[PDB]
């Protein structure tokens, strides 16, 4: 069972800075099947990135996805008051075997 | 009808063909348990040159 971990455990930054979140896979995960979700408290997860580099509908362009192999990256160029919430990375596929990260919190 | 006449003379006439029609339909496909990964082709972020 692939294990998805996230770094850092909690990221502290001020608005307008650059945020970088890393997702690590215990094995080699296809870059076509990595997703990034943003969850504000009291809400359902919001899909930000799919295919590890594609933004969902309505997602601001300040979010970007990249990486391959075992290392994947979610980069926020300019933090905003709305960009401070939990972030999950998910490994999925065309088979019924998915995994999630443990969550990275971006705070003021 | 085959002779196109209302009067038929003595003899033996080939009028039609006989065929045993099929009873039911049989489908035999391989035992495959995977979905084709067409998502990474039609939904890739960047197509090649
Ligand atoms: C097809 O494969 C599955 C396992 O993947 C098996 O349970 C099933 O019995 C197989 N069916 C046939 C007709 O071989």
Please tell me the experimental approach by which this structure was elucidated.
cryo-EM
- Give all strands (DSSP E) within chain A, no chain letters: 4-7, 10-12, 19-25, 34-39, 46-50, 54-55, 63-68, 71-76, 86-91, 99-100, 104-107
Resolution in Å equals 2.7
Query: In this structure, what token pair is assigned to residue A44?
Result: 């359902």
For the CA of B31, the closest atom of ligand 1 is 1
What are the chain A neighbours of B44 within 8 Å (beta carbons)? Answer: 32, 51
What CATH number is attached to the domain comprising A37?
2.60.40.10
Q: Which run of H or E residues covers position B39?
A: helix B39-42
**Sign for the pseudo-dihedral over CA of A66, A69, A71, A72:** positive
Helix, strand, coil content of chain B in percent (nearest 5): 10, 0, 90
Query: In this structure, what token pair is assigned to residue A51?
Result: 């295919």
In the numeric block, the tokens 């006989």 are attached to B18
Asked if A43 has any chain B CB less than 8 Å from its own CB, the reply is: no
Range of the domain at A77: 4-108
Backbone angle region of A84, left / alpha / beta, with phi > 0 → left and psi within -120 to 50 → alpha: beta
Q: Least CB-CB distance to A94: which of B35, B45, B46?
A: B35
Q: How far is A88 from A68, CA to CA, in rounded Å?
A: 17
- The answer to whether B44 and A51 are in contact (CB under 8 A) is yes
Residue closest via CA to ligand 1's atom 13 equals B31
When divided into structural domains, chain A yields a total of 1
């Amino acid at each position: 069972a692939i294990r998805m971990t996230q770094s850092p455990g909690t990221l502290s930054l001020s608005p307008g800075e650059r945020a970088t979140l890393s997702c690590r896979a215990s094995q080699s995960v296809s870059s076509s099947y990595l997703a990034w979700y943003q969850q504000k408290p009291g809400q359902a997860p919001r899909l930000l990135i799919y295919g590890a580099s594609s933004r969902a509908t309505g997602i601001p362009d300040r979010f970007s996805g990249s990486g391959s192999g075992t290392d994947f990256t979610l980069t926020i160029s300019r933090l905003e008051p709305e960009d401070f919430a939990v972030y999950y990375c998910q490994q999925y596929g065309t088979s019924p075997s998915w995994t999630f990260g443990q969550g990275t919190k971006v705070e003021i | 009808c085959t002779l196109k006449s209302f009067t038929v003379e003595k003899g033996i006439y080939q009028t039609s063909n006989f065929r045993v029609q099929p009873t039911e339909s049989i489908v035999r496909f391989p035992n495959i348990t995977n979905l084709c990964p067409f998502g990474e082709v039609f939904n890739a972020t960047r197509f090649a040159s």
